Design an enzyme around this catalytic site. Structure first.
Site, mmCIF file in Angstrom:
data_model
loop_
_atom_site.group_PDB
_atom_site.id
_atom_site.type_symbol
_atom_site.label_atom_id
_atom_site.label_comp_id
_atom_site.label_asym_id
_atom_site.label_seq_id
_atom_site.Cartn_x
_atom_site.Cartn_y
_atom_site.Cartn_z
ATOM 1 N N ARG A 1 0.708 -1.174 -0.116
ATOM 2 C CA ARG A 1 0.044 -0.082 -0.090
ATOM 3 C C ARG A 1 0.936 1.167 0.045
ATOM 4 O O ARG A 1 0.188 2.388 -0.590
ATOM 5 C CB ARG A 1 -0.961 0.117 1.201
ATOM 6 C CG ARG A 1 -2.191 0.981 0.744
ATOM 7 C CD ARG A 1 -2.965 1.425 2.135
ATOM 8 N NE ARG A 1 -4.385 1.990 1.511
ATOM 9 C CZ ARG A 1 -4.676 2.834 2.413
ATOM 10 N NH1 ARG A 1 -4.438 3.176 3.371
ATOM 11 N NH2 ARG A 1 -6.229 3.168 1.983
ATOM 12 N N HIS B 1 0.203 4.200 -2.714
ATOM 13 C CA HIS B 1 -0.154 5.706 -2.376
ATOM 14 C C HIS B 1 0.882 6.624 -2.618
ATOM 15 O O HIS B 1 0.746 7.818 -2.880
ATOM 16 C CB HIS B 1 -0.456 5.631 -0.747
ATOM 17 C CG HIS B 1 -1.655 5.199 -0.660
ATOM 18 N ND1 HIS B 1 -2.578 5.790 0.274
ATOM 19 C CD2 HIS B 1 -2.760 4.765 -1.335
ATOM 20 C CE1 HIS B 1 -3.709 5.254 0.536
ATOM 21 N NE2 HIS B 1 -4.036 4.834 -0.578
ATOM 22 N N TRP C 1 -10.413 -8.786 3.520
ATOM 23 C CA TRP C 1 -11.111 -9.336 2.284
ATOM 24 C C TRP C 1 -11.093 -10.736 1.974
ATOM 25 O O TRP C 1 -11.765 -11.382 1.066
ATOM 26 C CB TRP C 1 -10.575 -8.730 1.233
ATOM 27 C CG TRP C 1 -10.582 -7.126 1.006
ATOM 28 C CD1 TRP C 1 -11.623 -6.310 0.530
ATOM 29 C CD2 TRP C 1 -9.461 -6.075 1.425
ATOM 30 N NE1 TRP C 1 -11.326 -4.985 0.601
ATOM 31 C CE2 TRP C 1 -10.109 -4.969 1.297
ATOM 32 C CE3 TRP C 1 -8.426 -6.324 2.144
ATOM 33 C CZ2 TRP C 1 -9.275 -3.715 1.446
ATOM 34 C CZ3 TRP C 1 -7.667 -5.048 2.545
ATOM 35 C CH2 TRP C 1 -8.262 -3.864 2.278
HETATM 36 C C1 HEM Z 1 -10.529 2.860 -5.431
HETATM 37 C C2 HEM Z 1 -9.277 2.461 -5.269
HETATM 38 C C3 HEM Z 1 -9.045 2.104 -3.860
HETATM 39 C C4 HEM Z 1 -9.651 2.390 -2.517
HETATM 40 C C5 HEM Z 1 -10.686 3.307 -2.465
HETATM 41 C C6 HEM Z 1 -8.950 1.665 -1.582
HETATM 42 C C7 HEM Z 1 -9.232 1.877 -0.250
HETATM 43 C C8 HEM Z 1 -8.483 1.038 0.822
HETATM 44 C C9 HEM Z 1 -8.861 1.251 2.199
HETATM 45 C C10 HEM Z 1 -9.965 2.044 2.972
HETATM 46 C C11 HEM Z 1 -7.835 0.414 2.650
HETATM 47 C C12 HEM Z 1 -7.919 0.358 4.349
HETATM 48 C C13 HEM Z 1 -6.747 0.995 4.746
HETATM 49 C C14 HEM Z 1 -6.870 0.570 6.458
HETATM 50 O O1 HEM Z 1 -7.921 0.924 7.156
HETATM 51 O O2 HEM Z 1 -5.782 0.156 6.965
HETATM 52 C C15 HEM Z 1 -7.074 -0.129 1.961
HETATM 53 C C16 HEM Z 1 -6.218 -1.022 2.214
HETATM 54 C C17 HEM Z 1 -5.054 -1.587 1.243
HETATM 55 N N1 HEM Z 1 -5.085 -1.399 -0.249
HETATM 56 FE FE1 HEM Z 1 -6.324 -0.140 -1.086
HETATM 57 N N2 HEM Z 1 -7.754 0.955 -2.155
HETATM 58 C C18 HEM Z 1 -8.069 1.217 -3.617
HETATM 59 C C19 HEM Z 1 -7.063 0.591 -4.552
HETATM 60 C C20 HEM Z 1 -5.739 -0.053 -4.119
HETATM 61 C C21 HEM Z 1 -4.801 -0.242 -4.916
HETATM 62 C C22 HEM Z 1 -4.726 0.209 -6.285
HETATM 63 C C23 HEM Z 1 -3.993 -1.044 -4.083
HETATM 64 C C24 HEM Z 1 -2.418 -1.472 -4.663
HETATM 65 C C25 HEM Z 1 -2.163 -2.093 -5.860
HETATM 66 C C26 HEM Z 1 -4.248 -1.115 -2.959
HETATM 67 C C27 HEM Z 1 -3.541 -2.103 -2.068
HETATM 68 C C28 HEM Z 1 -4.215 -2.050 -0.632
HETATM 69 C C29 HEM Z 1 -3.571 -2.775 0.492
HETATM 70 C C30 HEM Z 1 -2.326 -3.736 0.013
HETATM 71 C C31 HEM Z 1 -4.098 -2.578 1.710
HETATM 72 C C32 HEM Z 1 -4.051 -3.256 2.918
HETATM 73 C C33 HEM Z 1 -3.075 -2.417 3.869
HETATM 74 C C34 HEM Z 1 -2.852 -2.974 5.272
HETATM 75 O O3 HEM Z 1 -3.457 -4.110 5.466
HETATM 76 O O4 HEM Z 1 -2.116 -2.179 5.908
HETATM 77 N N3 HEM Z 1 -5.330 -0.655 -2.932
HETATM 78 N N4 HEM Z 1 -7.418 0.313 0.523
#
Ligand code: HEM
EC number: 1.11.1.5
Length: 291
Positions: A45, A49, A188
């Site tokens: 992430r 970001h 997820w």
């Molecule tokens: C419409 C696009 C996206 C939205 C709205 C979104 C939103 C989110 C949200 C709300 C979280 C949870 C953050 C938390 O509470 O820790 C998250 C986690 C994450 N996202 Fe996204 N995301 C999107 C696209 C992506 C993309 C494009 C990638 C990378 C290729 C990605 C990789 C991750 C990963 C790996 C996590 C888990 C982080 C953790 O466990 O600490 N996301 N995302």
């Protein structure tokens, strides 16, 4: 503003494989983080970001300048929690002070995907740190409470098409949402520190219920204890996205190949590679090296 990749002086593939390896060894060692999820997901992430602030219209933001190190960007509410990935990388940067910040944040993501048994992601060096005033403002990363039209329009700014978006979203197999971070809670799926196509399978095969979480936000929940954000769920509400979701749910190799391309592209948006730059590097995993 043109950002030309500039290879860290005298460095070559072996130097970066050493950085890869140090990241990978710390990923293995520091296994307790996040209730034993480990740092893989937050490093992916972080890479996204730090790249996803890019605007194709004027080449602002993007991975090149490593601007997350400045307080306006590390304190973006959208980046809540990523400080854990940054702190992970700190001893890596201390050991290898010659690597640029953008190169280290992006390499962290590559290394995490690969060490989590994901696809190989070719990676190019040459990001150069840029000054504090080049840090993009907050607000360029996406909201989770929106629909497919939002998602599609959002990602046009990153020059991503439908296939690229659906492929990139497969990274949500990894890690979890954390209520205090994003206002969403839950993983997820079951395999959340191994890179697989589970995100697509769960979207199609779980029985999802639209519920409110304890932050009063709606999310989709299953009896298995999994969740999807509204933006995740939009991928099966929109018929164009749905087709692609089904493709990746039914072909792991295709998902790997398409993810790899899209993720490299994400990490390279905004960067001009000279004609005589090195070819992209493909790092060996620790396992492939016998380490
Ligand atoms: C419409 C696009 C996206 C939205 C709205 C979104 C939103 C989110 C949200 C709300 C979280 C949870 C953050 C938390 O509470 O820790 C998250 C986690 C994450 N996202 Fe996204 N995301 C999107 C696209 C992506 C993309 C494009 C990638 C990378 C290729 C990605 C990789 C991750 C990963 C790996 C996590 C888990 C982080 C953790 O466990 O600490 N996301 N995302």
């Amino acid at each position: 503003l043109v950002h030309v990749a500039s290879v860290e002086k005298g460095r070559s593939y072996e130097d970066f494989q050493k950085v890869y390896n140090a990241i990978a060894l710390k990923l293995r060692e520091d296994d307790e983080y996040d209730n034993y999820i480990g740092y893989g997901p937050v490093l992916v992430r972080l890479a996204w970001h730090t790249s996803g602030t890019w605007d194709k219209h004027d080449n602002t933001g993007g991975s090149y300048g490593g601007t997350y190190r400045f307080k306006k960007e590390f304190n973006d509410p959208s980046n809540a929690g990523l400080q854990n990935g940054f702190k992970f990388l700190e001893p890596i940067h201390k050991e290898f002070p010659w690597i640029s910040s953008g190169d280290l944040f992006s390499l962290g993501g590559v290394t995490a995907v690969q060490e989590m048994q994901g696809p190989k992601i070719p990676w190019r060096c040459g990001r150069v740190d840029t000054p504090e005033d080049t840090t993009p403002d907050n607000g360029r990363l996406p909201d989770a409470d929106k629909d497919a039209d939002y998602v599609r329009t959002f990602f046009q700014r990153l020059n991503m098409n439908d296939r690229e978006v659906v492929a990139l979203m497969g990274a949500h197999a990894l890690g979890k949402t954390h209520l205090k971070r994003s206002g969403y809670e839950g993983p997820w799926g079951a395999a959340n520190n191994v890179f697989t196509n589970e995100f697509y399978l769960n979207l199609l095969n779980e029985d999802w219920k639209l519920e409110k979480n304890d932050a009063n936000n709606e999310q989709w929940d299953s009896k298995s204890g999994y969740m999807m954000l509204p933006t995740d769920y939009s991928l099966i509400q929109d018929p164009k996205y749905l087709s692609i979701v089904k493709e990746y749910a039914n072909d792991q190799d295709k998902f790997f190949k398409d993810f790899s391309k899209a993720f490299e592209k994400l990490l390279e948006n905004g960067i001009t590679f000279p004609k005589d730059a090195p070819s992209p590097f493909i790092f060996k995993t620790l396992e492939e090296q016998g380490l």
